[PDB]
Design a protein around this ligand. Structure first.
Ligand SMILES: *[C@@H]1O[C@H](CO)[C@@H](O)[C@H](O)[C@H]1NC(C)=O
Ligand SMILES: *[C@@H]1O[C@H](CO)[C@@H](O)[C@H](O)[C@H]1NC(C)=O
Ligand SMILES: *[C@@H]1O[C@H](CO)[C@@H](O)[C@H](O)[C@H]1NC(C)=O
Ligand SMILES: *[C@@H]1O[C@H](CO)[C@@H](O)[C@H](O)[C@H]1NC(C)=O
Ligand SMILES: *[C@@H]1O[C@H](CO)[C@@H](O)[C@H](O)[C@H]1NC(C)=O
Ligand SMILES: *[C@@H]1O[C@H](CO)[C@@H](O)[C@H](O)[C@H]1NC(C)=O
Lengths: 399, 181, 361, 182, 399, 360
């Protein structure tokens, strides 16, 4: 959609280091537009290509009971013909491949919101205080351990003309802003206004999950200079790359649940949404929604005594037939099933080939784990706790 | 078969005085993007900083003639136009003897703005250094400069200067055989 | 060199890494110690053929093996079923490659295998034989080298020198030979003698062997490459297959027998034609018709055979011949499907997925 | 009537080509040379993250010696010790007496790495340059088998000799062994 | 026991390469602790043992003029019995002898402060930025030609959580920091706070010299494989080892007088202390300590005109009785006498045994050098001045 | 050999020992009896000359009167001691430079070990047997058998030589020491009751034995092969411990061999003989020093103490004023030297020496 963002950022830095404020503000704005245009292009192209040439599986095809030589060749030819159709479509409609890749340090500087720093400085200089407080507050939200930003915000707020409604973020995803705002509105006993924000949080969470599933079909990564002697076959390279892609798709559920203001990712993200929804609908007066949401929570954790007590209370006060006729949400069912299948496949690959994997969720049952790596997992947990205690002892000795 | 050239970048070298000549380069514009554009933009002098008045520090005999570090002549610097570094794209080509340029890196995805050049067919440098060009004329100039007397640091005693470094346009991509120079 | 050879039972005293034995043989050669170099070169050839046989065998317990089928809760997600099957096949490969004698030693690189498949060692062999007074095997090895590389210059002069000397004049034989080549040779030789039953027996014994060799040579070509570009998922599991498709396409012209310095054109069609004529000469039209239909399937445009089927159709109702007796044999249909599908897939792949960055001049 | 003291043992299990050829049991002198013994035991056990397992004997000289232990490269130039790249030689209180005695191999002054010997004949001329640190108590017929394998010009064996297994054994009470051959 | 430093440093660099930050920080902290623990153990045991069994000779033993044979045997037996007692005490107290040795590369790298580099990187990556900036400053003072470390330090200073009073060194001994700080404060003309730092510097210097003379008794150093053909006697091997030990003791006055930042060791270390202390004392208002320090400096150097004039001036302002009552310090007396005796012994050994010795000080009177060495040095001076005048004549001919 | 002396060595004979041994062995391989025997004689002369020169150097360096020390060093003992040691080492180097025998190539220590075990004596006796030089062959065999008396073929040769009459005229040692001959003469004089002659032999056997013992004791400080690289004090302690091991054996080697079994306590037994002779001559005034010397050397004798009880019953009859009960200084000095050597070695063995070599 535009020239590479890194070139624009480098030009902006070079212009800013000599006092050309219009140049730096223009360059930073252009880069911040180009990155989003590129990401939207990749997402749309990948989704369209996946949905235009679908996986035409043929379970009706029983290859041969008598012959065994050519049937495998026919199956392989058909499958790879479908694959070649998809690859041709993708290559044609993605466009140039130079703009779609950039250095890692550039991604680092684009995750610390440095262009917002340059923009706030230049916009204060230009006397555009609204677009200065916007950038300054966005950077401060990006890094909460900069009290220099705090005194800069105080210096800006001392000047008149600053509006409270202009304290915007413009960087974080909506599914997190709405969730934090909803929990803040709920904490002070406002159940009437609490529900819409959380409902939007679920909707935007499902949309964001769908958008982030289709964005780590990326280049394979190697162990540094180990790709000179990479000597794997066709059906081994395919499975290696697909295993790493599944690792991406299963580790993109701990990135949707991390805010830079919080040093740790949220624990039990999504079942917590349902818990807050059931509590809110309890407080409001809508009780069918309360029982539905309590049940949809129980499906994730069927061994919770306190929520079972709450569900028993809701059913006892309400009618038994209504409670029995009401069941879990559908999208939660589909999400759970697909994640369970991916986890099963990844655990089997770990058991056989030897590729590491760390579970990013807690609702995972015990039936999917092979009875061979739990020993290793508690062993590594033991080493971690021992290292923590030993570091504490070293700190005590230093004093 | 052979790869295609798009643009020609011409250097005009001088050994202190009594210049040696002009060394033309043909750059593989379609095989390797993101390294040809950097080189042409650095050469022609569009971003301010450029190759004009560079210094070929390492002039190792029948190994290479490195250079291009315009910030300081020590030989451990240089900044591109894509920030400071940028990654390797693809080593679709290999070093086939004298005259095959490359990019000099200090590790993995540590490309800067420094040259390479070969004078003998090197085989242990295939798969580490991206190749993006192949000299076309004036290889006798390279053969002449690679003979200058150096100390035990490979830095020539007589300074070499790139007086001019422009850009020459070609109206048609013509392929080149992959033998040498 | 190929007399004391048996894949299922290989002597344990001649199992060493291929590159080490080959380098030892070459170094002994350069030092002018013939007999030991002859022995070790023969050992290296035997070990190369053993490795190829082991690969072509282990690459066929995985494809042609039944697999389970999960429930509907997994049958509704094809993107998981396909790659789960591929994971199971990769595991079967990695498990069946452990347990074979030829794979637990140190494997060779790619350039050594390139030289071996280029039929270069035979060069040294012929010279070595002439330095142990083994002239028949010397001319046999020189001719085997020239059979694959008929554009040589020094080897043509050497072969002229060997042919000039008497004694070695009927020992011109190949040493890289298969079963179907000699079987087809016997079949043609006996057919020229108007001996019929032996001809049909030879053809019905030749057919399965050629098809088995062809399918093994197809399924042994799913090999590795050298990484030279970093691309996406769908653009990197669909660019390895293009090279694999080139390898699979250049796999029918290598199996055709060569006779009298001229390769046989349309091998399968010719073999079916010989079968059909041998059937017809015996007035046994029961199985003659399927061979004719198969030949029509392989060669659509013909005149004599089209007249033959016209003549068959005119009297279709006097021999008690049914319509289902006119279908081509299934193996021929499978061969036709595979060849046509591969050709059209390459025609589709050399239009979009290949990059346009290389020229001839 | 005097001999050094064995404190710990280290045992190998070898494959020559496609056949298992048995066990070699080293007795290691921990009192006299503690540093080299600790390094060799920590490499044999392999708990540090690397070890001798699946390495190969990359030199075999008939009626002179057999040498191996390089696991990094495999051709005779690598090998990193537990104590960094290289460490100095400790002391030369023991000599080479004949067949069976195991010492360390260095490529210059105080450059001990991870490549050992097993001598096979009396080795007087190597006395005072290499640090002897063990003797092969049981299983010498295996070394006799390994030594006569066919080798090429570089003396790397034609087949492959592999240290398929390598572990350690504890001695609860150090016991002294003589200073003779075998 | 206390594990070796090389093993810990190798483990730390390995864990840094793999990518476990707690492992590397813990390992290098342990290494830097254990090295100093080993050094302290060596110093304490050596000093205590050598001070528990003194060398006092038998007062009752007398030379025997009549029987000239037995007296030698008895003398050797007594002296070597005392030596045996000392060696027994050392061997029992020290412990394992293997730990105190490590290769040349490890000493060379521990001299350049690499564990501080790895520690600052790991402490930045574990978010303990105070110790990160401390280690960064330690490395930066350790190596003055590292601009990337300067950029890191500037970023840390600009980064929040970093102050200006937390800058420590943790590596340089006090006797150097105190002297540099005293000379810096005296440079800005604050004599009021320029005497105490120099007092502390003097006392810590004497403590450090006494402590680090006792770490010179080390293994004899054979060049290459020369120990195979070394065929020295008993009473010659003893003298060879002791002459080397005396040389390594005397080359300890040129190791305390150099700093990692400075390229060349300081000139006249200790007379400079006394000179600066004299200037500060004169400026403050002390006259007694001024004249005392001037007299003490005169003891080392007998031809310095400026200090002679200063002494005369202070005798003029004060009384002659005050000058004559106060004398030089005792420490200078003892230090000078001991160093002069050691120099005389080493010069005799050079004159006879031919073991080279270059003088590490300029206050040594010329009478200690023997006649042969004096003549050789005079010839060297004559040929040097001849070369200088030849160079001058050649340059004149060039003009 | 009386065919040379310390100050009578010729000029051509000053040639390296290793070359002489090698050429002698070559000639012995060539059956050239005269050349090999003569060159072996030259080699033995060279070996004895080397021993004499080393002993004289190491007994003139240590016996050097101590020069007057400086005053300022009286407060630093370590520097005083090691300065004296440096002076001694330099004097040793000068004196060794002053002697001719050390100006040639130094043979390896294994050749010295072979010479100490008298390996050339077997070759000498075999050459003499091949040359029918029977008396010299018997002399060489008698010389060699003092170290390996269990040799079977040597026993056969000795029996065959003794078969011929007069073989006892050829039994003797080529390296017989003077004090041994003087002691034999003393014993013969005592046997013949010639008391007046025996005292001269005893008074000539004391100083010569003392000189020999001190020479062999003080010439033991030699080289050592470097096995471990250790600290300063520990390495010197190990050096001197090995030197002690070599030192404490002198009183055992120097013991005379009479009748095939060494006579225990040479000095003490000869002192007892002297006391008996003095009692036979009624010279108890000079016998009392011998008695107290014997007690000092051998206190474990009850007969001796009752003899002194009988002496002290009426000691005033003869007129002794206790001056005769003071032991002779040489006996006291010898006792102190031996006692210190043994106690020091015991302490070093218990505390210093490493225990990493075991039994069996
Ligand atoms: C509960 O809310 C749903 C929609 O949110 C609505 O359809 C339903 O009528 C509500 N129930 C009550 C009792 O208000
Ligand atoms: C390979 O095929 C044979 C043929 O029946 C079979 O017995 C064997 O089990 C197969 N191996 C594997 C690993 O499936
Ligand atoms: C193979 O080709 C034949 C053409 O006769 C046609 O039936 C179909 O395309 C293929 N048949 C099978 C069974 O795959
Ligand atoms: C000189 O300084 C010393 C500091 O130790 C102080 O005690 C003394 O009083 C000073 N002199 C005078 C005259 O006060
Ligand atoms: C020892 O050397 C000195 C100096 O010559 C002198 O006493 C004498 O010559 C030698 N012998 C003795 C017994 O002193
Ligand atoms: C000699 O020995 C006696 C008794 O053993 C002892 O009293 C004396 O101190 C020793 N030393 C001297 C020099 O007499």
């Amino acid at each position: 959609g535009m020239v590479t963002p890194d070139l624009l950022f480098a030009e902006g830095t070079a212009a800013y280091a000599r006092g050309d404020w219009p140049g730096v503000v223009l360059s930073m704005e252009r880069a911040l537009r180009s990155r989003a245009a590129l990401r939207a292009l990749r997402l749309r192209c990948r989704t369209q290509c996946a949905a235009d040439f679908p996986w035409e599986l043929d379970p009706d095809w029983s290859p041969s009971p008598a012959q065994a030589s050519g049937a495998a060749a026919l199956r392989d030819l058909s499958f790879f013909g479908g694959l070649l159709r998809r690859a041709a479509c993708l290559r044609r409609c993605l466009g140039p491949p130079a703009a779609h890749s950039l250095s890692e340090e550039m991604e680092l500087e684009f995750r610390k919101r440095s262009p917002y720093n340059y923009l706030q400085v230049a916009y204060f200089k230009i006397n555009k205080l609204e677009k200065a407080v916007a950038a300054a507050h966005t950077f401060f939200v990006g890094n909460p351990e900069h009290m220099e930003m705090q005194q800069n915000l105080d210096y800006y707020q001392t000047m008149s003309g600053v509006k409270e409604a202009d304290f915007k973020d413009l960087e974080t995803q909506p599914h997190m802003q709405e969730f934090r705002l909803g929990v803040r509105l709920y904490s002070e006993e406002q159940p009437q206004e609490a529900v819409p924000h959380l409902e939007a949080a679920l909707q935007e969470y499902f949309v964001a999950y769908e958008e982030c599933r289709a964005l780590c079909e990326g280049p394979y990564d190697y162990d540094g200079y180990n790709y000179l002697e990479y000597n794997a076959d066709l059906f081994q390279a395919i499975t290696d790359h697909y295993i790493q892609v599944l690792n991406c798709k299963q580790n993109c559920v701990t990135e949707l649940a991390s805010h830079p203001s919080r040093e740790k990712p949220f624990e039990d993200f999504l079942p917590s949404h349902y818990n807050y929804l059931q509590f809110a609908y309890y407080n409001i007066g809508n009780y069918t929604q309360a029982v539905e949401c309590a049940k949809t929570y129980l499906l994730f954790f069927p061994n919770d005594e306190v929520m079972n007590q709450n569900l028993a209370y809701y059913a006892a006060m309400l009618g038994e037939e209504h409670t029995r006729s009401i069941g879990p949400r559908e999208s939660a069912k589909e999400y759970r099933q697909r994640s369970l299948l991916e986890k099963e496949l990844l655990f089997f690959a770990y058991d056989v080939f030897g590729i590491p994997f760390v579970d990013p969720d807690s609702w995972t049952p015990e039936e999917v784990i092979p009875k061979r790596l739990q020993e290793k997992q508690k062993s590594e947990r033991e080493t971690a706790v021992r290292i923590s205690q030993e570091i504490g002892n070293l700190m005590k000795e230093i004093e | 078969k052979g790869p295609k050239v798009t643009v020609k970048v011409y250097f005009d070298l001088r050994i202190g005085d009594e210049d040696v000549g002009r060394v033309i380069f043909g750059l593989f514009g379609k095989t390797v993007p993101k390294t040809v554009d950097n080189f042409v933009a650095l050469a022609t002098g569009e971003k301010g900083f450029g190759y004009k008045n560079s210094k070929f520090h390492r002039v190792i005999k029948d190994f290479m003639i490195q250079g291009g570090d315009f910030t300081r002549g020590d030989g451990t610097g240089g900044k591109s136009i894509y920030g400071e570094r940028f990654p390797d794209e693809n080593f679709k080509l290999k070093h086939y003897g004298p005259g095959w340029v490359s990019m000099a890196n200090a590790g993995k995805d540590t490309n800067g703005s420094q040259f390479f050049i070969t004078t003998v067919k090197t085989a242990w440098l295939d798969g580490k250094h991206v190749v993006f060009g192949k000299v076309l004329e004036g290889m006798e100039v390279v053969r002449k400069v690679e003979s200058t007397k150096t100390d035990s640091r490979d830095k020539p005693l007589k300074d070499v200067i790139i007086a001019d470094c422009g850009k020459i346009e070609v109206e048609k991509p013509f392929a080149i055989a992959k033998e040498a120079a | 060199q190929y007399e004391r050879y048996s894949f299922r039972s290989f002597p344990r005293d001649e199992l060493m890494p291929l590159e080490s034995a080959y380098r030892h043989a070459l170094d002994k050669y350069s030092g002018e110690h013939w007999a030991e170099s002859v022995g070790y070169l023969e050992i290296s050839l035997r070990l190369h053929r053993l490795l190829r046989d082991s690969e072509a065998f282990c690459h066929r317990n995985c494809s042609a093996a039944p697999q389970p089928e999960p429930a509907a809760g997994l049958a509704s997600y094809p993107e998981l079923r396909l790659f789960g099957g591929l994971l199971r096949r990769a595991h079967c490969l990695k498990r069946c490659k452990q347990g074979l004698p030829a794979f637990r030693q140190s494997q060779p690189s790619r350039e050594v295998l390139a030289d071996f498949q280029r039929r270069e060692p035979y060069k040294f062999l012929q010279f070595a034989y002439f330095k142990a007074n083994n002239l028949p095997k010397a001319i046999a090895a020189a001719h085997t080298f020239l059979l694959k590389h008929p554009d040589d210059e020094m080897m043509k002069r050497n072969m002229a020198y060997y042919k000039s000397l008497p004694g070695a004049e009927d020992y011109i034989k190949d040493l890289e030979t298969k079963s179907y080549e000699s079987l087809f040779i016997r079949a043609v030789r006996a057919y020229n003698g108007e001996n019929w039953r032996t001809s049909i027996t030879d053809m019905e014994l030749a057919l399965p062997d050629f098809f088995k060799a062809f399918y093994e040579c197809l399924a042994a070509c799913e090999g590795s490459r050298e990484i030279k570009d970093f691309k996406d998922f769908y653009l990197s599991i669909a660019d390895h297959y293009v090279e694999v498709l080139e390898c699979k396409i250049q796999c029918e012209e290598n199996l055709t027998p060569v006779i009298g310095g001229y390769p046989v054109e349309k091998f399968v069609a010719t073999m079916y034609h010989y079968l059909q004529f041998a059937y017809y000469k015996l007035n046994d039209l029961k199985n003659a018709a399927p061979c004719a239909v198969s030949y029509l399937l392989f060669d659509q445009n013909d005149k004599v055979m089209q007249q033959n089927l016209v003549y068959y159709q005119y009297h279709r109702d006097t021999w008690g011949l049914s319509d289902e007796h006119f279908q081509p044999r299934p193996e021929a249909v499978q061969f036709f499907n595979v060849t046509t599908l591969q050709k059209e897939l390459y025609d589709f792949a050399k239009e979009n997925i290949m990059d346009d960055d290389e020229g001839e001049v």
